């Protein structure tokens, strides 16, 4: 690699970071959008106030404003549902480590409640909240309300650092390695500039996913993150080994690889900055399918990329990885659903199943109520789109288990429901080929009626090749497709994946059978479970 390749391609101008004139050739359309107007201006210069006053029909009549609602607003966590819910916006937070409060949960519920049939909320595969039904004129008030309850939605979509994932048992687990909350909190604060916006990291070539590992279980899926912090002692000191470049896309899925770097715990933010700076400065900005950080690592080589991180560290030093980390390879991933003792004597947490991660405003109020009456007012989200309520006096558990809402959000659902994960799909998502949430519940219900099993088989449903529901990590994955019935009529289908493993012995699954009509999946899955996962016909 020539020295010329290492020239930073972006420059700070008027407090924002923009592509240098000479590097603007051959860029993708989104890169053109960002040059035409810096997206962070909608928040940091309050551009949203005036935009929110223009009727959507009028917004659509000029490129600048259409690009504002369809692209730039993702920097404020707003996603126009142009195809499937025209004029309405999904809104996505920053929620480091999946931690929410009952007050925050009630606030979100009050927003979606306003929108009636157009409103609901979802737990995401990054242990985050999304709300739906938002109309543009309401955006200024919603931003204020979020701030008032201690939430931000900044930089949650587009070419930004995504939700920092951590251990859902952080601080409460007798078996945790390190409490991940301080680190995910620090990362989120750094990314969002303490909820004011951070333009130094808002103009990346592409999305970028971070996680901090605190569990032997590897609940955080470090193998599929752009940056994963693996806890490890080096020369008598606590810190993290760094894995880099994990990603999924329609074209390519790759597991994270060692950067061959260790940082002390206090250097978590400096190294995140260094890596993001190198990605920002040097990343390819052409074909959108070749813009994720792994593509840069492949171009420069891991050592080449490492040197770029090193030069961006304070005192320009980056230690080599520690030969071992703290994560025990001898480990069985623990079920967190149900009642479990915390490390604090006399206290328990409860894991509750949220069917396909979908909640309505009344459900959200009920969960917030439970957290206040039984816990400490805290609700935790998980990447399987479930919830944990921590900090419950164990003497309160008998009463809790009699709560009517627990028949809907159960501490002990059937085993296949425990592992079921499904993306938004075509109810709201414009990229979706099929409906996912309702369909996956129906199919899973029918399958479990036919077989019993003891192995915690994990089934993931995703609506298109973007694979937001991570079908490549599943025991059985289902990727939406259109296919044909025996009469040659168009029907919704799934490509079925097998081979995905999580935890320390991770592996990416692959397509096993293409183009199966959704109406034919029950018998296929029943047989797969009996033949491959020890299930027994009822
Ligand atoms: C909500 C969520 C799925 C879910 O039901 O939980 C989701 C939903 C969407 N994803 Fe995703 N992604 C979600 C996790 C993921 C993950 C999984 C992960 O992070 O571990 C991936 C695969 C891992 C990865 O990114 O490396 C994922 C890969 C994508 C991609 C393909 C990325 C690529 O490099 O090609 C897109 C399309 C894109 O960005 O170009 C996409 C784009 C989208 C959009 C914003 C598409 C669009 O605007 O309609 C979806 C919004 C639909 C909606 O209304 O909800 N989403 N998306 C997740 C929100 C996470 C969060 O809170 O931030
Ligand atoms: S996998 Fe496809 S259908 Fe599902 S939320 Fe992501 S982009 Fe939409
Ligand atoms: Cl996005
Ligand atoms: Cl759309
Ligand atoms: K769930």
Burial 135-154 (b: 16+ CB within 10 A, else e): ebebbeebbeebeeeebbbb
Please choose, from the candidates 336, 444, 357, the residue with its C-alpha nearest in 3D space to the C-alpha of residue 120: 357
- Ligand 2 binding pocket includes 467 (Cβ within 6 Å): yes
Output 79-87 pairs: Cβ under 8 A, ≥24 positions apart: 79/157, 81/132, 81/428, 81/429, 81/430, 82/430, 83/430, 84/426, 84/427, 84/428, 84/429, 84/430, 84/432, 85/118, 85/132, 85/428, 86/56, 87/56, 87/135, 87/136
**CATH of 414-538 among 3.30.413.10, 3.40.190.10, 3.40.720.10, 3.40.50.150:** 3.30.413.10
Nearest CA to ligand 1 atom 52: 429
CB contact at 8 A, 275 and 2? no
Please choose, from the candidates 362, 436, 368, 360, the residue with its C-alpha nearest in 3D space to the C-alpha of residue 119: 360
Rounded to the nearest whole angstrom, what is the distance from the C-alpha of residue 176 to the centroid of ligand 4? 41
165, two tokens = 């994932």
Q: How far apart are CA 424 and CA 462, in angstroms?
A: 8
- Ligand 2 binding pocket includes 425 (Cβ within 6 Å): yes
204, two tokens = 């990346």
Rounded to the nearest whole angstrom, what is the distance from the C-alpha of residue 488 to the centroid of ligand 1? 32
How many Cβ atoms are within 10 Å of 314's Cβ, its own excluded? 10
Annotated binding site: 81, 124-126, 128, 130, 132, 206-207, 209, 248, 289, 292, 385, 423-424, 429, 464, 468, 470
Helix (H) or strand (E) holding 271: helix 268-282
Annotated binding site for siroheme: 81, 124-126, 128, 130, 132, 206-207, 209, 248, 289, 292, 385, 424, 429, 468, 470
Q: How far apart are CA 78 and CA 62, in angstroms?
A: 19
- Ligand 2 binding pocket includes 205 (Cβ within 6 Å): no
Protein residues within 5 Å, CB atom, of ion ligand 4: 82-83, 430
- The half-sphere exposure of 354 on its side-chain side, counting CA atoms within 13 A, is 29
Q: How far apart are CA 472 and CA 515, in angstroms?
A: 17
- Find the DSSP H helices in 375-430: 397-400, 415-418
Q: How far apart are CA 355 and CA 413, in angstroms?
A: 9
- Ligand 1 binding pocket includes 241 (Cβ within 6 Å): no
Looking at all shown ligands, the one closest to residue 249's CA atom is 1
Protein residues within 5 Å, CB atom, of ion ligand 5: 354, 357, 385-386
Concatenating the DSSP letter of every residue in 167-194 gives -TTTTT-TT-SS--HHHHHHHHHHHHTT
End-to-end alpha carbon distance in the chain = 62
Q: How far apart are CA 500 and CA 462, in angstroms?
A: 14
Nearest CA to ligand 2 atom 4: 463
- Burial class (CB within 10 angstroms; exposed 0-12, middle 13-18, buried 19+) of 54: middle
| Alpha-carbon separation of residue 370 from 16, 272, 350 (angstroms) | 44, 37, 11
Q: 3-state SS of the chain: helix, strand, coil percent to 5? A: 35, 25, 40
| Alpha-carbon separation of residue 253 from 68, 206, 294, 469 (angstroms) | 30, 15, 10, 13
Instruction: Please check whether the two domains, 150-335 and 414-538, share a CATH topology.
Output: yes
- Ligand 2 binding pocket includes 160 (Cβ within 6 Å): no
How many Cβ atoms are within 10 Å of 330's Cβ, its own excluded? 6
| Alpha-carbon separation of residue 395 from 97, 345, 346, 351, 402 (angstroms) | 27, 12, 8, 17, 13
Strand locations in 333-440 (E): 338-341, 347-352, 358-359, 378-381, 387-393, 421-422
R_g of the chain computed on alpha carbons: 23
Q: How far apart are CA 94 and CA 98, in angstroms?
A: 9
Strands 129-135 and 247-248, by their bridges, are unpaired
- Burial class (CB within 10 angstroms; exposed 0-12, middle 13-18, buried 19+) of 461: buried
- Ligand 1 binding pocket includes 79 (Cβ within 6 Å): yes
- Ligand 1 binding pocket includes 386 (Cβ within 6 Å): no
- Ligand 1 binding pocket includes 130 (Cβ within 6 Å): yes
Facing residues of 480 across strands? Answer: 494
Q: What are phi and psi of 290, to 5 degrees?
A: -125, 25
511, two tokens = 């397509």
- Find the DSSP H helices in 319-460: 361-374, 397-400, 415-418, 437-450
| Alpha-carbon separation of residue 229 from 66, 214, 221, 242, 268 (angstroms) | 38, 9, 11, 5, 8
Looking at all shown ligands, the one closest to residue 87's CA atom is 4
Fold classification of 150-335 (topology level): Sulfite Reductase Hemoprotein; domain 1 (3.30.413)
- Ligand 2 binding pocket includes 517 (Cβ within 6 Å): no
Domain 1-149+336-413 class in CATH: alpha beta
- Ligand 1 binding pocket includes 270 (Cβ within 6 Å): no
Q: How far apart are CA 230 and CA 119, in angstroms?
A: 38
Rounded to the nearest whole angstrom, what is the distance from the C-alpha of residue 124 to the centroid of ligand 5? 9
């Amino acid at each position: 690699v020539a020295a010329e390749r290492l020239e930073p391609r972006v420059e700070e101008k008027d407090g924002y970071w923009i592509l240098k004139e000479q590097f603007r050739k051959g860029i993708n359309p989104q890169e053109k959008v960002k040059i035409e107007k810096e997206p962070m201006k909608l928040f940091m210069e309050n551009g949203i106030e005036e935009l929110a006053k223009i009727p959507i029909e009028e917004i659509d009549q000029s490129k600048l404003t259409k690009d504002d609602i369809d692209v730039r607003l993702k920097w404020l966590g707003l996603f126009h549902r142009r195809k499937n819910q025209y004029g309405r916006f999904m809104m996505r937070l920053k929620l480091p480590n999946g931690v929410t409060t009952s007050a925050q949960t009630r606030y979100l519920a009050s927003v979606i409640r306003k929108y009636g049939k157009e409103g609901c909320a979802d737990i995401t595969t990054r242990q985050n909240w999304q709300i739906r039904g938002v109309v543009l004129p309401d955006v200024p008030e919603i931003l204020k309300g979020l701030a008032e309850v201690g939430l931000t939605s900044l930089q949650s979509g587009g070419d930004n650092v995504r939700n920092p994932v951590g251990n859902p048992l952080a601080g409460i687990d007798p078996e945790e390695i390190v409490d991940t909350r301080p680190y995910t909190n620090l990362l989120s604060q750094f990314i969002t500039g303490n909820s004011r916006g951070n333009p130094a990291v808002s103009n990346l070539p592409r999305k970028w996913n971070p996680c901090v590992v605190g569990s032997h279980d590897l609940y955080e899926h470090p193998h599929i993150n752009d940056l994963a912090y693996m806890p490890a002692t080096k020369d008598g000191r606590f810190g993290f080994n760094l894995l880099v470049g994990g990603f999924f896309s329609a074209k390519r899925c790759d597991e994270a690889i060692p950067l061959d770097a260790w940082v002390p715990a206090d250097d978590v933010v400096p190294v995140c900055r260094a890596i993001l700076e190198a990605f920002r400065d040097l990343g390819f900005r052409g074909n959108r399918q070749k813009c994720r950080m792994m593509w840069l690592i492949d171009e420069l080589g891991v050592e080449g990329f490492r040197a770029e991180v090193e030069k961006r560290m304070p005192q320009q030093q980056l230690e080599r990885a520690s030969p071992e980390d703290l994560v025990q390879k001898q480990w069985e991933r623990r079920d967190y659903l149900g009642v479990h003792p915390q490390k604090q004597e006399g206290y328990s947490f409860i894991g509750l199943h949220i069917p396909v991660g979908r909640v309505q405003a009344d459900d959200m109020d009920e969960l917030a109520r439970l957290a206040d009456e039984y816990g400490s007012g805290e609700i935790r989200l998980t990447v399987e789109q479930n919830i944990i309520i921590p900090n419950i006096e164990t003497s309160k558990i008998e009463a809790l288990l009699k709560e009517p809402v627990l028949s809907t959000f159960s501490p002990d659902p059937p085993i296949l429901m425990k592992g079921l994960v499904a993306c938004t799909g075509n109810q709201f998502c414009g990229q979706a080929i099929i409906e996912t949430k309702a369909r996956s519940l129906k199919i899973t219900e029918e399958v479990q009626r036919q077989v019993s099993l003891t192995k915690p088989v994990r089934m993931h449903w995703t609506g298109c090749p973007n694979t937001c529901a991570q079908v490549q990590v599943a025991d059985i994955g289902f990727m939406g497709c259109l296919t044909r019935d025996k009469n040659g009529k168009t029907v919704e289908g799934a490509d079925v994946f097998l081979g995905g493993r999580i935890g320390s012995d991770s592996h990416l699954g692959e397509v096993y059978k293409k183009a199966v009509p959704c109406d034919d999946l029950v018998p296929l899955v029943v047989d797969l479970l009996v033949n491959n996962f020890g299930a027994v016909p009822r």
